[PDB]
Amino acid sequence: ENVAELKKSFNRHLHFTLVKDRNVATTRDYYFALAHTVRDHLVGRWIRTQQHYYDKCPKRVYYLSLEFYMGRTLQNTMINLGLQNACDEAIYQLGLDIEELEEIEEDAGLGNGGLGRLAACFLDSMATLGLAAYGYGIRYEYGIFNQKIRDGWQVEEADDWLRYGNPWEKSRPEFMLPVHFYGKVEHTNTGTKWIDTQVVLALPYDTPVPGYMNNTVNTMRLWSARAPNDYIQAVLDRNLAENISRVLYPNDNFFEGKELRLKQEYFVVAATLQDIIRRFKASKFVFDAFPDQVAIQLNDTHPALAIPELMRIFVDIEKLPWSKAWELTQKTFAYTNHTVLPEALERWPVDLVEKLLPRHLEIIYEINQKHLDRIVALFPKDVDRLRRMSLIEEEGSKRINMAHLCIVGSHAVNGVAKIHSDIVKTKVFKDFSELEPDKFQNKTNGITPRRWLLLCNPGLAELIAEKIGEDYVKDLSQLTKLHSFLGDDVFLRELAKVKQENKLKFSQFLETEYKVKINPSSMFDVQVKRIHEYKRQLLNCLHVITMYNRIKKDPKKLFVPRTVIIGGKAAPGYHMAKMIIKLITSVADVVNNDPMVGSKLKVIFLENYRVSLAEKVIPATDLSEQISTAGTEASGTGNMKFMLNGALTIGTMDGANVEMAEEAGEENLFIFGMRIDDVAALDKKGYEAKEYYEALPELKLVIDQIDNGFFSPKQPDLFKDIINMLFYHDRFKVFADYEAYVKCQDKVSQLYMNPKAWNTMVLKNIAASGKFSSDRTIKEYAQNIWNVEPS
Amino acid sequence: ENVAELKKSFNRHLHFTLVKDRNVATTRDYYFALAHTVRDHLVGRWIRTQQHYYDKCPKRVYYLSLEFYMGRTLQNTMINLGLQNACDEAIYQLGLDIEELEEIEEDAGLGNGGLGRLAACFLDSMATLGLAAYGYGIRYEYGIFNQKIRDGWQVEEADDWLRYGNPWEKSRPEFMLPVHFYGKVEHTNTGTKWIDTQVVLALPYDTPVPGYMNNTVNTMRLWSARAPNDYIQAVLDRNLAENISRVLYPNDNFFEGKELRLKQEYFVVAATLQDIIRRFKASKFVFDAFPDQVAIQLNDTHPALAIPELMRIFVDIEKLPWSKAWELTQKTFAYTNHTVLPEALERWPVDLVEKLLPRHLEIIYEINQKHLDRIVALFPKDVDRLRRMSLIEEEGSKRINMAHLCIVGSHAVNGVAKIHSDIVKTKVFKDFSELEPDKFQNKTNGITPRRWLLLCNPGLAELIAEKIGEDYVKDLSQLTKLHSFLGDDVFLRELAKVKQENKLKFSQFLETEYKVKINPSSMFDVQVKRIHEYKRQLLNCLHVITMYNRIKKDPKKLFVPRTVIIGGKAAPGYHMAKMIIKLITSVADVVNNDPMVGSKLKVIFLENYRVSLAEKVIPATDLSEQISTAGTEASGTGNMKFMLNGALTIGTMDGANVEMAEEAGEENLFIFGMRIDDVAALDKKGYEAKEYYEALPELKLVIDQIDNGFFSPKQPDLFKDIINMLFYHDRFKVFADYEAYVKCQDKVSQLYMNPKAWNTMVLKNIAASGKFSSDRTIKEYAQNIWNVEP
């Protein structure tokens, strides 16, 4: 009945929408035909959901982020709507392979990593929980670049994801808005005027966000820059305004103070706030109840400008008195802190802001005066306190500390993991938290069980549902029921078979994609995340070389075989990250082609790591590498995906790793290396990498091989830069955790030789992953920050 | 496809396609819902038509043009498909106004004027005649600019026609192709290689072209430039390649040798030829029969590069020997000449071509040598003949004469009107026509009766069909049957009522759009075409001022009232055209606000003249101004639209105007002024505008008022530039035709006072318009140049 109508709709779309028949249709046409067939099932509910929010007017949540790492939409939509099985059958009956059609879809890679994926995971949870929430960002013409490996090096290729069209976005021409830039401030008797500005239009594109089996369809609104309204040159120059939403800055945890980036931040903030204000004034709910109807979450400081923009609107446009506007503003905004790394901190030079946003610079100054006046009144003698709490930094050049603007403009500030939120509250912003202790909170990150379990690992989800029901999908805490099977050998072998099939499926991937032959029974050791010195795939590379030498030493020694996979993109300007990639492809080349090691150890640099590819490798993983230096990874989410999918974790007591051990029992994770306190002690005492290289014979060998050209014969000093940083500038102490790491790694393999105990531990991990659902994360945000409830 | 199912489809699209309901839908959503509803009716026939061409493999026609002035598509499609009445009813039942929805659609203004509209009219006729024809152009992101009038001056606004989406285009991703630029030529032992080039991808977008009531749906394929595959800057720099299809050059009859324009020309040529070759090799058809399967018409010299590109492909890629390739090339191409005006002539500097297209420059040189060798062999003593017939001009800087390249690479060359084709053949290219007399031809232009009668003037089409049947739609020569009603007073009054209702409808337009109050019973005097010194709306402006003074002179004099309308866009760099516009808005301001003239004379500068707006004003017109200097307007097509729609013509013996008099009887048109020979005689003898200003008292007054600030008090010398050109540099002799013009105009008004005789003449015009159908034009092209059949 349903299968029949689905095949009918597909043929209808292929004909009328793609203008094709079965003899001339391309694979891309079949994908689009299916996408349209599935898309139609979203319309009724999307209209009803948005209409419901208008009628019953519940408090609305607006997740304002410069990034939304959404991945592919077809499968996700089919699943949340309960149409996957019917569609799978419809496509099969028509003689096609749904998997092939699914591969046609481009990832919507409008994010760099964890930050943009958290936003994506949050949209899915907010819809599944039935909250009146909206995602607001920029519709980048180009997302995170596609990565290629040339002569072992990363090469960037433009990610032209819209070239063939996106059936999942809906232009909303009637809501276009003008955004202002430059110009000059004019203080009149009717109020202050921001005049002589250049205008860039913002056209919003709505993408539906289907809740998991609940008839709710929320919206993700992305803005695209358009020019307003020598002739030829004047028309070509329209490219200049449209360049604002042209490309996503491909840096993870790195502030790049480019003027264009500033424009993107203001662009999305101005369009968004105007749209929210307009929706408020049409709600039939004059802004007294604004914050009882509106909640705006600042995802990192990127949209910090939203604070003085709201004030600008309230004061300059709506004519509200400063005091009242300031109060509403704080009740409206909440700020989420995502990192304590110095290079990620946004500090915009007042000069640049003055030229681009002169009125906003005056507003920020005013906020700062009112702010410092309060502090001067309570702590008179304390002069330096004012210096430390100011939104303005006069170090060399004067600049705005965006993080401080976010704190004073918000009623709630949160970190993303216990350890991180603690550091944010008591160390980094001690001066602020002391004054307003109730302001700072923690909201441990999470991942959505739909995309990261049900979609990416159907085999595992089925096994679990077979044993404990399907309720866990909407309430992952349900996974603890998996404990009852701890001594169940048949279940443990079923668990091990699912993982075995994931590995085989992914092995097929690696062999067609890459030269090398993979040992499907080897242990899959994986580290996939953005290349960073702080995340240390370098430390991992030190271990791979160690295992290499060891085999070369004693060839016939009983060695648990491994397929080591390291994948991730480096920001374009990050030289060390790029050197580390080359170092890894070099090592692999030597290991994979050495006859004495052969099928014992294989190394793969998984290129173009991205959301759709994460969905493949993660379910096939046995060992998840989460080895950042303690105190560096604010939270992490990749660690959670691997835990939910049956992999054991080797890592430090950092970010959310700590809470994973808490939930699963430290004994059921391979924790190692320095802890927050240990890195501190070492810092005070002073770190000298040279000493470990001295003490550690296995390390000295690894290092001498790198620095001598053993892994770059034609370029003997190619890795000279890596050697120098490690010996004289390693802020992340690679050599200091090397011994504990290799020791920890040895124990992992020992446990791997015992299938029954390895799988018993995996079970304890999966049964303990319930806390890491973004459904739980969102619930806490909802009741402790946004003050909202399901609809 | 009746009313109930049409309303159903509309609601379905509004819901699933526009994601709306009746309470939140916008007017734009309603337009799109209807467009999609109508579009669906094209799919079956479009797939079957293209499939038919593959199976039965008839010789195909490819109209290669840098311009396609298509206008709006909804109404046209509804009409050619016989769905207009049903849709009209469906939309009405749903509580909407189809006229309002139709106004939402943007014109597809991918052309400047006559040249691009001729291409558009040809696509409609080729589909109605059932020919296997394709239109190949560039999908400009921006078409001809939208014109605004600020402080009486034209201002240009970007024509962002794709902003909200084009439901009539279909991306054809599987046929994307790479186009090459720059690089360098490498002569090897395996053949010549064009290497180290930069690549720009070309993605084609197909638009259906429905034939009139015949199940045929052809294709118009437009190419869009896309880049292949410091980081941020590198991605932004992708804008540079995509800039190739960014904007239409807004010049009419004017060559602007900009490098970007050269890129556009090669771009469309390279993508098009590769696509045609590929389709040829898949036809199930050896390039021996290539020209028996392919015909490529060069619309003006703009795609001239297609000749050495085809050769490049045949020789460098397909490895054919030069002689064989050259033969197939000539049998493939045919060239159409659209103008004899010097500023429109394409002469690209060999330097620029050398850098951008080094391999094509070598090919053009080779063609020129083989060409001159032939001429040297037949006319040894004649040295200067070689200089005159060369594709290369060494005057100052060396440059390529694109027109000469088109002549030698084509087997047929045609003009667009008898008088023009004659000049092209015997005067301009005498050296070539003498050698190959059979090469040069004429193919008088035409307009499609669908868009230009049935669509734009439903009232007239109905009246005609009521009296002589509907066969005239597909065979306009049928209009001669209208003669039988020449003495029929009731028919003549019915004819006059249709024109009366057009005027009222358009008057509603002019009053809401413009301040002024219009006399619906006044004579609508109209001149709408691109602003050009050669088209002379200036001469027209001299007459308006004349009528003005006359009224001021004798207020109570019996004067047939007029609503004078002049509209058109000036190219951005054309200073004189812009000055003339300002001069016209200035005059209007004075006339329209002068209490002594009042409702006697009103002047309007119809802004943003374009295809959809032509469809409104043309049917409402009584008098059509076709007054270019004799010998300047190669043909004209606006003249034909007005004739088919019931307007009388006042004009010179130029372009197709001459043939209009031939068909309708010179007596039934208001011809005047110098003729081709008269302008020549005056040229030899020397023209001195000062003498007419001397002799003509009415003229002297007009001129003194202009030059003294009567029409620009705050800027007394504002029109100084206009005065100078008219006295010392008027290549188009405005003062010389002024007297004959005003005299001719006086007679027009005299005939207008006699409704029965005016309408009797209009009837003789309409009944004689059959020759000007583009169906007849295409039939002649098909049997005498392309050698193709339905």
Ligand SMILES: O=C(N[C@@H](Cc1ccccc1)C(=O)N1CC(C(=O)O)C1)c1cc2cc(Cl)ccc2[nH]1
């Ligand atoms: O564009 C059409 N369908 C659309 C269908 C579509 C819509 C959204 C996403 C993917 C596909 C189409 O093919 N594309 C939009 C993409 C782009 O903008 O690049 C590609 C279309 C159907 C049709 C049918 C007729 Cl009869 C005439 C013109 C037509 N265009």
Ligand SMILES: Cc1cc2nc3c(=O)[nH]c(=O)nc-3n(C[C@H](O)[C@H](O)[C@H](O)CO)c2cc1C
């Ligand atoms: C038929 C014709 C077309 C012209 N088109 C243009 C044009 O498109 N742009 C421009 O800048 N000038 C144009 N001109 C003006 C020309 O370049 C030159 O400036 C004047 O003719 C010198 O008086 C045109 C002139 C003529 C006669």
Ligand SMILES: *Cc1c(COP(=O)(O)O)cnc(C)c1O
């Ligand atoms: C989850 C995810 C990340 C974040 O990974 P971490 O290891 O937690 O930094 C990055 N990239 C992609 C594509 C992801 O799916």
Ligand SMILES: *Cc1c(COP(=O)(O)O)cnc(C)c1O
């Ligand atoms: C037909 C047409 C033209 C050509 O008119 P002429 O009077 O022949 O110059 C130019 N522009 C538009 C919009 C047209 O419809």
Ligand SMILES: CC(=O)N[C@@H]1O[C@H](CO)[C@@H](O)[C@H](O)[C@H]1O
């Ligand atoms: C170069 C150019 O645009 N020429 C124009 O071509 C059209 C189409 O043939 C003619 O009707 C017109 O008189 C002529 O001015």
